[PDB]
DNA sequence: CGGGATTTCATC
RNA sequence: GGCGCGUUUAUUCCAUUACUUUGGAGCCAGUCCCAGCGACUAUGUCGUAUGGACGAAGCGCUUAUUUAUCGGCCGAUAAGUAAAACGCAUCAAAGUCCUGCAGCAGAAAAUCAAA
DNA sequence: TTTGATTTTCTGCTGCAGGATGAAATCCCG
């Protein structure tokens, strides 16, 4: 059958196994700790078993909770202190936390800097730079840089990176010796969480050696982010200089007096970031007000200034908690609107004749916003004002009052609903967002009364209300639940934690987990002989740096008021993988338990119908013996064709490009798109009935898509294994994916399918390249198999130029092929939001009615571009995302199967001596892709003539 | 003078 | 989608240890009860079960409490209450986790000194 | 998105960093 575990069994039997290197492929077993509610669930089976194991003792729970609280508080205190230090001195901190090179390089330094880049915070002295040229694995010389000082105490190996003027390049979690500062009593630093928070009731060693990493990792990450952003800030400022200069030139071309507001330079505080971003936003608003719409100048003509993004915030401390409070900001908005209500009332009541229509231009929605079931608050506010104007005439004095009454009623109702929801147990972010939109529209309309009288006051009010609107939209999802972690830096005797089993019979084992992190607790680890096992006793093993295993015996008391005892709860497959695996067992050392965690996160309990915290044990198992890249030989190929109606059509072929029948065409996940469409229809119905859907449809589409992806991946892997085959994908940059107007991150699955197969082959120890491959996606999906011709836009330009009218009508040719200029093309106009069908010949006649003799090249370049767009939309080789049409010969068959075969044939093409000759020609400085296109077309035609006979 | 830690130092 | 239920997800031995999910299948989706949308015939009604709250989600086999058709209390046939040997719809899959920041995937409003 | 012209709009939750541990010298203890 098709089981992933049978595939893994064959893979294990397919080749020899060898022990893992310095670090093995990490894998986490996430089990759940036996709890009283777990036992309650277990007791209610129809076929009740003989023995129900005991739950976890209450003392263990209390001790674990106290330990988690202490660890969290210690981490918070340490990060707070180091945030204060950073807020005092950035340079010294980021110089200290720089990760030194390993204290093992005894290579002789040869070339110092031909100097004053940074300074060691210990001596505040400049760090000399030294280079070192060596020979790498593949023959490319590499240049490294290191920092050493005149002080023997400061003779470290701080990393330096070149630029074209130097940077650190590394930030570690163990560079700064955290132990000697806040734990040991000899140091007199005023911060000592162990002596202060825990009251000398917690063990020093393990807790400190965990806190060190648990804080310095985050510190190093933030320092890396900031030290990387510091250079891009300067470069972005430099680019903005030229962009502003060009914009000023364009503005002065029309004789426009540019406002005297200048760009703040690259700052190093977030206040400067905010000021520069506000200046940029105001400049963009002014340009949109005066140039984009007034002059009908498009966006290509205006390269704008850039806002500042990418400046990080300090971990766990600069995470804003929104202390300004939601209701306080709402009341501030109310007060500001009430103060500025008179200004808007006077402006609208005392409006001129024709100025009334232009005053309401932003308030009225166009077809684009109206057709999509719902409009922004500004649009509906304008429509309500239009209704009031229709109902009560031009009496805007009372119209404003009635509109204020309606908006105030809606605001009060929304506020009451929000308070009622948020008081007891619930929260309504949708209502908050709607109320915020209403308040924003009301504030805009109210303060629009000062658009031409008091410019600065109006702008200040606008900025304040906009930032208040942003804060009111952002604050509600601040969350209240955070994970709690309890690290175990390693599994050795010192750390006083171990995994134990009961030697029942020959192989059966009971499972207990013991935590010893308190002073006064008793836990004895006794070394024993290899086969001294006895019943009612716990036994375990230990790992060693030299590859030795030294099993030991555990003895303790179940009523100890200090230690923590954990019974587990898991399933057969998990036990066969980690706990009681048959082939790779922890006794031999093939499977190793390196580190674990006591993660406590909220999970849904169906018995209580609620989400409650549930202790997990993220036992990270490092597979110490993996497969060897010694017996693997791809051969057969499985060309995967992507699409929507058919999730995947796969074509089999040999390593001669000759397809063979062993199943030849297989389709997996049929009608699943119909289920996706049904789910989408239900969601759209729920939106039409309220504007949103519930949590039942939260991930139905996502879950179905992921299930389809994983099932298809399993099927592909089984086919590859059973046929000794390989899979063909494309070479796409990281982050590849389509983003239209309604795209979701879950459709970036081609790369994610590659990644899933990569991870699955990676836990077994082999890279993705063994059975997963990529094709150079240059013109791969743009080729047909009947003519060997790949369409380019130069041919489109030639077709546009050649377009003329003969006795039978318009005529144009591609590669000498006469094309009947006839037929109708359908387009989806966003202004109409419907289907409009136009005739190519009729539109050409209409466009040429302004010219003589139908010479398109004699028209304006805009008319030629429009004719080019018409010809391209008529002669597009990809009319639909799921349809391909051959422009040259139009051989007729099932398109998807032919495309599936052609994908594999293209991947085969992406290795040839023709490509070698193309590379040699490209070494002549002719960096043109047209040579590649010609070579690929010629090679494909030659191969079609020789062995790749098209369908007969 | 070993139990028995106990911490402290240290380190890809 | 709401409720339940277990199956298989290991080649001779490694829990029929249950966890975290998705499917197949079995049953059930009504109550403006409160609040978002159109007409707004105006802050009034209707509808679109939308967001939450509210019930909602098998059958028989084996063992005792609810009766006499029979002779001067014996079982004749069956209810549900319980246990549980239990049989059917009911049969299939996969898992590698943490901390921090917030950010990365676009295109249609879009033409000029339009190279 | 895939040949030359481009950039403020409305959508939605993942994309980049940091990783997954034994000697040494002491101490409480006489």
PDB file of N, CA and C in Angstrom, chain A residues 806-888:
ATOM      1  N   UNK A 806      -5.973  43.817 -45.539  1.00  0.00           N
ATOM      2  CA  UNK A 806      -6.041  43.278 -46.890  1.00  0.00           C
ATOM      3  C   UNK A 806      -7.477  43.364 -47.403  1.00  0.00           C
ATOM      4  N   UNK A 807      -7.712  42.738 -48.560  1.00  0.00           N
ATOM      5  CA  UNK A 807      -9.041  42.776 -49.164  1.00  0.00           C
ATOM      6  C   UNK A 807     -10.074  42.054 -48.310  1.00  0.00           C
ATOM      7  N   UNK A 808      -9.659  41.026 -47.571  1.00  0.00           N
ATOM      8  CA  UNK A 808     -10.572  40.271 -46.723  1.00  0.00           C
ATOM      9  C   UNK A 808     -10.657  40.817 -45.303  1.00  0.00           C
ATOM     10  N   UNK A 809      -9.949  41.903 -45.000  1.00  0.00           N
ATOM     11  CA  UNK A 809      -9.920  42.488 -43.681  1.00  0.00           C
ATOM     12  C   UNK A 809      -8.493  42.688 -43.227  1.00  0.00           C
ATOM     13  N   UNK A 810      -8.321  42.830 -41.916  1.00  0.00           N
ATOM     14  CA  UNK A 810      -6.991  43.012 -41.357  1.00  0.00           C
ATOM     15  C   UNK A 810      -6.203  41.707 -41.405  1.00  0.00           C
ATOM     16  N   UNK A 811      -4.893  41.834 -41.608  1.00  0.00           N
ATOM     17  CA  UNK A 811      -4.019  40.677 -41.710  1.00  0.00           C
ATOM     18  C   UNK A 811      -2.698  40.975 -41.015  1.00  0.00           C
ATOM     19  N   UNK A 812      -2.223  39.999 -40.246  1.00  0.00           N
ATOM     20  CA  UNK A 812      -0.919  40.079 -39.601  1.00  0.00           C
ATOM     21  C   UNK A 812      -0.325  38.678 -39.578  1.00  0.00           C
ATOM     22  N   UNK A 813       1.000  38.614 -39.463  1.00  0.00           N
ATOM     23  CA  UNK A 813       1.705  37.343 -39.543  1.00  0.00           C
ATOM     24  C   UNK A 813       2.722  37.226 -38.417  1.00  0.00           C
ATOM     25  N   UNK A 814       2.958  35.986 -37.992  1.00  0.00           N
ATOM     26  CA  UNK A 814       4.053  35.643 -37.092  1.00  0.00           C
ATOM     27  C   UNK A 814       4.835  34.506 -37.737  1.00  0.00           C
ATOM     28  N   UNK A 815       6.127  34.736 -37.978  1.00  0.00           N
ATOM     29  CA  UNK A 815       6.986  33.775 -38.674  1.00  0.00           C
ATOM     30  C   UNK A 815       6.396  33.386 -40.028  1.00  0.00           C
ATOM     31  N   UNK A 816       5.771  34.356 -40.693  1.00  0.00           N
ATOM     32  CA  UNK A 816       5.193  34.143 -42.002  1.00  0.00           C
ATOM     33  C   UNK A 816       3.830  33.488 -42.015  1.00  0.00           C
ATOM     34  N   UNK A 817       3.277  33.142 -40.856  1.00  0.00           N
ATOM     35  CA  UNK A 817       1.977  32.490 -40.766  1.00  0.00           C
ATOM     36  C   UNK A 817       0.879  33.545 -40.809  1.00  0.00           C
ATOM     37  N   UNK A 818       0.093  33.540 -41.884  1.00  0.00           N
ATOM     38  CA  UNK A 818      -1.032  34.456 -41.999  1.00  0.00           C
ATOM     39  C   UNK A 818      -2.039  34.187 -40.889  1.00  0.00           C
ATOM     40  N   UNK A 819      -2.473  35.256 -40.226  1.00  0.00           N
ATOM     41  CA  UNK A 819      -3.396  35.164 -39.102  1.00  0.00           C
ATOM     42  C   UNK A 819      -4.690  35.872 -39.468  1.00  0.00           C
ATOM     43  N   UNK A 820      -5.799  35.139 -39.413  1.00  0.00           N
ATOM     44  CA  UNK A 820      -7.119  35.706 -39.658  1.00  0.00           C
ATOM     45  C   UNK A 820      -7.472  36.614 -38.487  1.00  0.00           C
ATOM     46  N   UNK A 821      -7.501  37.921 -38.734  1.00  0.00           N
ATOM     47  CA  UNK A 821      -7.821  38.888 -37.686  1.00  0.00           C
ATOM     48  C   UNK A 821      -9.341  38.896 -37.548  1.00  0.00           C
ATOM     49  N   UNK A 822      -9.848  38.047 -36.659  1.00  0.00           N
ATOM     50  CA  UNK A 822     -11.280  37.893 -36.449  1.00  0.00           C
ATOM     51  C   UNK A 822     -11.484  37.246 -35.087  1.00  0.00           C
ATOM     52  N   UNK A 823     -12.721  37.305 -34.605  1.00  0.00           N
ATOM     53  CA  UNK A 823     -13.032  36.746 -33.307  1.00  0.00           C
ATOM     54  C   UNK A 823     -13.214  37.809 -32.247  1.00  0.00           C
ATOM     55  N   UNK A 824     -13.704  37.408 -31.082  1.00  0.00           N
ATOM     56  CA  UNK A 824     -14.022  38.335 -30.008  1.00  0.00           C
ATOM     57  C   UNK A 824     -13.218  38.003 -28.756  1.00  0.00           C
ATOM     58  N   UNK A 825     -12.776  39.050 -28.065  1.00  0.00           N
ATOM     59  CA  UNK A 825     -11.957  38.931 -26.866  1.00  0.00           C
ATOM     60  C   UNK A 825     -12.738  39.499 -25.691  1.00  0.00           C
ATOM     61  N   UNK A 826     -12.743  38.770 -24.579  1.00  0.00           N
ATOM     62  CA  UNK A 826     -13.501  39.135 -23.389  1.00  0.00           C
ATOM     63  C   UNK A 826     -12.534  39.619 -22.316  1.00  0.00           C
ATOM     64  N   UNK A 827     -12.886  40.721 -21.657  1.00  0.00           N
ATOM     65  CA  UNK A 827     -12.069  41.307 -20.606  1.00  0.00           C
ATOM     66  C   UNK A 827     -12.939  41.657 -19.407  1.00  0.00           C
ATOM     67  N   UNK A 828     -12.323  41.643 -18.227  1.00  0.00           N
ATOM     68  CA  UNK A 828     -13.013  41.945 -16.973  1.00  0.00           C
ATOM     69  C   UNK A 828     -12.597  43.339 -16.518  1.00  0.00           C
ATOM     70  N   UNK A 829     -13.408  44.333 -16.873  1.00  0.00           N
ATOM     71  CA  UNK A 829     -13.120  45.719 -16.517  1.00  0.00           C
ATOM     72  C   UNK A 829     -13.433  45.934 -15.042  1.00  0.00           C
ATOM     73  N   UNK A 830     -12.474  46.500 -14.304  1.00  0.00           N
ATOM     74  CA  UNK A 830     -12.675  46.721 -12.875  1.00  0.00           C
ATOM     75  C   UNK A 830     -13.625  47.884 -12.617  1.00  0.00           C
ATOM     76  N   UNK A 831     -13.709  48.832 -13.552  1.00  0.00           N
ATOM     77  CA  UNK A 831     -14.673  49.916 -13.399  1.00  0.00           C
ATOM     78  C   UNK A 831     -16.104  49.406 -13.534  1.00  0.00           C
ATOM     79  N   UNK A 832     -16.340  48.472 -14.457  1.00  0.00           N
ATOM     80  CA  UNK A 832     -17.669  47.905 -14.641  1.00  0.00           C
ATOM     81  C   UNK A 832     -17.932  46.690 -13.759  1.00  0.00           C
ATOM     82  N   UNK A 833     -16.893  45.935 -13.397  1.00  0.00           N
ATOM     83  CA  UNK A 833     -17.025  44.721 -12.590  1.00  0.00           C
ATOM     84  C   UNK A 833     -17.997  43.731 -13.231  1.00  0.00           C
ATOM     85  N   UNK A 834     -17.934  43.642 -14.554  1.00  0.00           N
ATOM     86  CA  UNK A 834     -18.763  42.708 -15.309  1.00  0.00           C
ATOM     87  C   UNK A 834     -17.957  42.236 -16.516  1.00  0.00           C
ATOM     88  N   UNK A 835     -18.615  41.533 -17.434  1.00  0.00           N
ATOM     89  CA  UNK A 835     -17.975  40.996 -18.627  1.00  0.00           C
ATOM     90  C   UNK A 835     -18.392  41.810 -19.841  1.00  0.00           C
ATOM     91  N   UNK A 836     -17.407  42.350 -20.553  1.00  0.00           N
ATOM     92  CA  UNK A 836     -17.626  43.094 -21.789  1.00  0.00           C
ATOM     93  C   UNK A 836     -16.819  42.423 -22.890  1.00  0.00           C
ATOM     94  N   UNK A 837     -17.468  42.158 -24.021  1.00  0.00           N
ATOM     95  CA  UNK A 837     -16.856  41.463 -25.146  1.00  0.00           C
ATOM     96  C   UNK A 837     -16.706  42.448 -26.297  1.00  0.00           C
ATOM     97  N   UNK A 838     -15.506  42.509 -26.870  1.00  0.00           N
ATOM     98  CA  UNK A 838     -15.216  43.409 -27.975  1.00  0.00           C
ATOM     99  C   UNK A 838     -14.637  42.613 -29.135  1.00  0.00           C
ATOM    100  N   UNK A 839     -14.801  43.159 -30.336  1.00  0.00           N
ATOM    101  CA  UNK A 839     -14.321  42.535 -31.561  1.00  0.00           C
ATOM    102  C   UNK A 839     -12.983  43.150 -31.947  1.00  0.00           C
ATOM    103  N   UNK A 840     -12.012  42.294 -32.274  1.00  0.00           N
ATOM    104  CA  UNK A 840     -10.675  42.779 -32.602  1.00  0.00           C
ATOM    105  C   UNK A 840     -10.683  43.619 -33.875  1.00  0.00           C
ATOM    106  N   UNK A 841     -11.297  43.107 -34.944  1.00  0.00           N
ATOM    107  CA  UNK A 841     -11.311  43.835 -36.209  1.00  0.00           C
ATOM    108  C   UNK A 841     -12.096  45.136 -36.094  1.00  0.00           C
ATOM    109  N   UNK A 842     -13.231  45.108 -35.392  1.00  0.00           N
ATOM    110  CA  UNK A 842     -14.040  46.314 -35.238  1.00  0.00           C
ATOM    111  C   UNK A 842     -13.291  47.367 -34.430  1.00  0.00           C
ATOM    112  N   UNK A 843     -12.616  46.951 -33.355  1.00  0.00           N
ATOM    113  CA  UNK A 843     -11.845  47.901 -32.561  1.00  0.00           C
ATOM    114  C   UNK A 843     -10.667  48.457 -33.352  1.00  0.00           C
ATOM    115  N   UNK A 844     -10.033  47.623 -34.182  1.00  0.00           N
ATOM    116  CA  UNK A 844      -8.968  48.122 -35.048  1.00  0.00           C
ATOM    117  C   UNK A 844      -9.501  49.147 -36.042  1.00  0.00           C
ATOM    118  N   UNK A 845     -10.685  48.889 -36.607  1.00  0.00           N
ATOM    119  CA  UNK A 845     -11.308  49.860 -37.501  1.00  0.00           C
ATOM    120  C   UNK A 845     -11.585  51.170 -36.778  1.00  0.00           C
ATOM    121  N   UNK A 846     -12.119  51.090 -35.556  1.00  0.00           N
ATOM    122  CA  UNK A 846     -12.411  52.299 -34.791  1.00  0.00           C
ATOM    123  C   UNK A 846     -11.138  53.076 -34.474  1.00  0.00           C
ATOM    124  N   UNK A 847     -10.063  52.371 -34.113  1.00  0.00           N
ATOM    125  CA  UNK A 847      -8.816  53.043 -33.767  1.00  0.00           C
ATOM    126  C   UNK A 847      -8.143  53.651 -34.991  1.00  0.00           C
ATOM    127  N   UNK A 848      -8.284  53.021 -36.154  1.00  0.00           N
ATOM    128  CA  UNK A 848      -7.661  53.507 -37.378  1.00  0.00           C
ATOM    129  C   UNK A 848      -8.509  54.538 -38.117  1.00  0.00           C
ATOM    130  N   UNK A 849      -9.684  54.891 -37.589  1.00  0.00           N
ATOM    131  CA  UNK A 849     -10.532  55.874 -38.259  1.00  0.00           C
ATOM    132  C   UNK A 849      -9.955  57.280 -38.152  1.00  0.00           C
ATOM    133  N   UNK A 850      -8.979  57.482 -37.270  1.00  0.00           N
ATOM    134  CA  UNK A 850      -8.308  58.767 -37.138  1.00  0.00           C
ATOM    135  C   UNK A 850      -7.073  58.883 -38.020  1.00  0.00           C
ATOM    136  N   UNK A 851      -6.687  57.812 -38.707  1.00  0.00           N
ATOM    137  CA  UNK A 851      -5.499  57.797 -39.544  1.00  0.00           C
ATOM    138  C   UNK A 851      -5.861  57.398 -40.968  1.00  0.00           C
ATOM    139  N   UNK A 852      -4.881  57.526 -41.860  1.00  0.00           N
ATOM    140  CA  UNK A 852      -5.051  57.251 -43.282  1.00  0.00           C
ATOM    141  C   UNK A 852      -4.126  56.108 -43.677  1.00  0.00           C
ATOM    142  N   UNK A 853      -4.628  55.217 -44.534  1.00  0.00           N
ATOM    143  CA  UNK A 853      -3.909  54.077 -45.103  1.00  0.00           C
ATOM    144  C   UNK A 853      -3.540  53.016 -44.074  1.00  0.00           C
ATOM    145  N   UNK A 854      -4.080  53.101 -42.857  1.00  0.00           N
ATOM    146  CA  UNK A 854      -3.967  52.038 -41.854  1.00  0.00           C
ATOM    147  C   UNK A 854      -2.516  51.727 -41.491  1.00  0.00           C
ATOM    148  N   UNK A 855      -1.639  52.726 -41.554  1.00  0.00           N
ATOM    149  CA  UNK A 855      -0.250  52.539 -41.142  1.00  0.00           C
ATOM    150  C   UNK A 855      -0.136  52.813 -39.648  1.00  0.00           C
ATOM    151  N   UNK A 856      -0.078  51.745 -38.848  1.00  0.00           N
ATOM    152  CA  UNK A 856      -0.087  51.898 -37.395  1.00  0.00           C
ATOM    153  C   UNK A 856       1.188  52.579 -36.912  1.00  0.00           C
ATOM    154  N   UNK A 857       2.320  52.295 -37.562  1.00  0.00           N
ATOM    155  CA  UNK A 857       3.589  52.880 -37.143  1.00  0.00           C
ATOM    156  C   UNK A 857       3.603  54.398 -37.276  1.00  0.00           C
ATOM    157  N   UNK A 858       2.698  54.968 -38.066  1.00  0.00           N
ATOM    158  CA  UNK A 858       2.600  56.411 -38.226  1.00  0.00           C
ATOM    159  C   UNK A 858       1.707  57.066 -37.180  1.00  0.00           C
ATOM    160  N   UNK A 859       1.059  56.281 -36.322  1.00  0.00           N
ATOM    161  CA  UNK A 859       0.210  56.840 -35.284  1.00  0.00           C
ATOM    162  C   UNK A 859       1.055  57.291 -34.097  1.00  0.00           C
ATOM    163  N   UNK A 860       0.369  57.649 -33.016  1.00  0.00           N
ATOM    164  CA  UNK A 860       1.046  57.902 -31.756  1.00  0.00           C
ATOM    165  C   UNK A 860       1.483  56.576 -31.136  1.00  0.00           C
ATOM    166  N   UNK A 861       2.517  56.639 -30.295  1.00  0.00           N
ATOM    167  CA  UNK A 861       3.017  55.431 -29.647  1.00  0.00           C
ATOM    168  C   UNK A 861       1.963  54.830 -28.721  1.00  0.00           C
ATOM    169  N   UNK A 862       1.065  55.664 -28.193  1.00  0.00           N
ATOM    170  CA  UNK A 862      -0.013  55.146 -27.365  1.00  0.00           C
ATOM    171  C   UNK A 862      -0.989  54.280 -28.141  1.00  0.00           C
ATOM    172  N   UNK A 863      -1.365  54.716 -29.345  1.00  0.00           N
ATOM    173  CA  UNK A 863      -2.249  53.911 -30.186  1.00  0.00           C
ATOM    174  C   UNK A 863      -1.583  52.597 -30.573  1.00  0.00           C
ATOM    175  N   UNK A 864      -0.287  52.648 -30.893  1.00  0.00           N
ATOM    176  CA  UNK A 864       0.447  51.427 -31.203  1.00  0.00           C
ATOM    177  C   UNK A 864       0.499  50.497 -29.998  1.00  0.00           C
ATOM    178  N   UNK A 865       0.660  51.059 -28.798  1.00  0.00           N
ATOM    179  CA  UNK A 865       0.652  50.235 -27.599  1.00  0.00           C
ATOM    180  C   UNK A 865      -0.701  49.600 -27.340  1.00  0.00           C
ATOM    181  N   UNK A 866      -1.776  50.345 -27.607  1.00  0.00           N
ATOM    182  CA  UNK A 866      -3.117  49.781 -27.470  1.00  0.00           C
ATOM    183  C   UNK A 866      -3.343  48.645 -28.463  1.00  0.00           C
ATOM    184  N   UNK A 867      -2.901  48.828 -29.709  1.00  0.00           N
ATOM    185  CA  UNK A 867      -3.017  47.763 -30.702  1.00  0.00           C
ATOM    186  C   UNK A 867      -2.182  46.553 -30.301  1.00  0.00           C
ATOM    187  N   UNK A 868      -0.993  46.797 -29.747  1.00  0.00           N
ATOM    188  CA  UNK A 868      -0.162  45.725 -29.216  1.00  0.00           C
ATOM    189  C   UNK A 868      -0.847  44.977 -28.084  1.00  0.00           C
ATOM    190  N   UNK A 869      -1.509  45.692 -27.173  1.00  0.00           N
ATOM    191  CA  UNK A 869      -2.247  45.033 -26.101  1.00  0.00           C
ATOM    192  C   UNK A 869      -3.383  44.187 -26.662  1.00  0.00           C
ATOM    193  N   UNK A 870      -4.093  44.706 -27.666  1.00  0.00           N
ATOM    194  CA  UNK A 870      -5.152  43.925 -28.303  1.00  0.00           C
ATOM    195  C   UNK A 870      -4.602  42.646 -28.923  1.00  0.00           C
ATOM    196  N   UNK A 871      -3.491  42.752 -29.656  1.00  0.00           N
ATOM    197  CA  UNK A 871      -2.924  41.572 -30.303  1.00  0.00           C
ATOM    198  C   UNK A 871      -2.385  40.582 -29.276  1.00  0.00           C
ATOM    199  N   UNK A 872      -1.790  41.083 -28.192  1.00  0.00           N
ATOM    200  CA  UNK A 872      -1.256  40.202 -27.159  1.00  0.00           C
ATOM    201  C   UNK A 872      -2.374  39.472 -26.425  1.00  0.00           C
ATOM    202  N   UNK A 873      -3.472  40.173 -26.126  1.00  0.00           N
ATOM    203  CA  UNK A 873      -4.584  39.517 -25.446  1.00  0.00           C
ATOM    204  C   UNK A 873      -5.296  38.541 -26.377  1.00  0.00           C
ATOM    205  N   UNK A 874      -5.297  38.822 -27.683  1.00  0.00           N
ATOM    206  CA  UNK A 874      -5.857  37.864 -28.630  1.00  0.00           C
ATOM    207  C   UNK A 874      -4.912  36.695 -28.886  1.00  0.00           C
ATOM    208  N   UNK A 875      -3.604  36.948 -28.949  1.00  0.00           N
ATOM    209  CA  UNK A 875      -2.616  35.926 -29.270  1.00  0.00           C
ATOM    210  C   UNK A 875      -1.796  35.505 -28.054  1.00  0.00           C
ATOM    211  N   UNK A 876      -2.389  35.565 -26.864  1.00  0.00           N
ATOM    212  CA  UNK A 876      -1.695  35.094 -25.674  1.00  0.00           C
ATOM    213  C   UNK A 876      -1.641  33.572 -25.662  1.00  0.00           C
ATOM    214  N   UNK A 877      -0.439  33.031 -25.452  1.00  0.00           N
ATOM    215  CA  UNK A 877      -0.276  31.585 -25.370  1.00  0.00           C
ATOM    216  C   UNK A 877      -0.837  31.009 -24.079  1.00  0.00           C
ATOM    217  N   UNK A 878      -1.199  31.856 -23.118  1.00  0.00           N
ATOM    218  CA  UNK A 878      -1.774  31.431 -21.843  1.00  0.00           C
ATOM    219  C   UNK A 878      -3.053  32.224 -21.604  1.00  0.00           C
ATOM    220  N   UNK A 879      -4.126  31.909 -22.340  1.00  0.00           N
ATOM    221  CA  UNK A 879      -5.382  32.655 -22.143  1.00  0.00           C
ATOM    222  C   UNK A 879      -5.925  32.551 -20.730  1.00  0.00           C
ATOM    223  N   UNK A 880      -5.805  31.380 -20.110  1.00  0.00           N
ATOM    224  CA  UNK A 880      -6.208  31.164 -18.727  1.00  0.00           C
ATOM    225  C   UNK A 880      -5.039  30.508 -18.008  1.00  0.00           C
ATOM    226  N   UNK A 881      -5.061  30.577 -16.675  1.00  0.00           N
ATOM    227  CA  UNK A 881      -3.984  29.983 -15.889  1.00  0.00           C
ATOM    228  C   UNK A 881      -3.917  28.474 -16.090  1.00  0.00           C
ATOM    229  N   UNK A 882      -5.031  27.861 -16.484  1.00  0.00           N
ATOM    230  CA  UNK A 882      -5.103  26.422 -16.703  1.00  0.00           C
ATOM    231  C   UNK A 882      -5.204  26.046 -18.178  1.00  0.00           C
ATOM    232  N   UNK A 883      -4.946  26.983 -19.091  1.00  0.00           N
ATOM    233  CA  UNK A 883      -5.066  26.728 -20.521  1.00  0.00           C
ATOM    234  C   UNK A 883      -3.844  27.271 -21.250  1.00  0.00           C
ATOM    235  N   UNK A 884      -3.283  26.459 -22.144  1.00  0.00           N
ATOM    236  CA  UNK A 884      -2.166  26.850 -22.995  1.00  0.00           C
ATOM    237  C   UNK A 884      -2.551  26.628 -24.450  1.00  0.00           C
ATOM    238  N   UNK A 885      -2.282  27.623 -25.294  1.00  0.00           N
ATOM    239  CA  UNK A 885      -2.629  27.581 -26.709  1.00  0.00           C
ATOM    240  C   UNK A 885      -1.368  27.827 -27.526  1.00  0.00           C
ATOM    241  N   UNK A 886      -1.108  26.948 -28.491  1.00  0.00           N
ATOM    242  CA  UNK A 886       0.054  27.088 -29.358  1.00  0.00           C
ATOM    243  C   UNK A 886      -0.208  28.142 -30.428  1.00  0.00           C
ATOM    244  N   UNK A 887       0.640  29.171 -30.460  1.00  0.00           N
ATOM    245  CA  UNK A 887       0.488  30.242 -31.439  1.00  0.00           C
ATOM    246  C   UNK A 887       0.950  29.824 -32.831  1.00  0.00           C
ATOM    247  N   UNK A 888       1.810  28.807 -32.928  1.00  0.00           N
ATOM    248  CA  UNK A 888       2.442  28.498 -34.205  1.00  0.00           C
ATOM    249  C   UNK A 888       1.668  27.463 -35.012  1.00  0.00           C
TER     250      UNK A 888
END
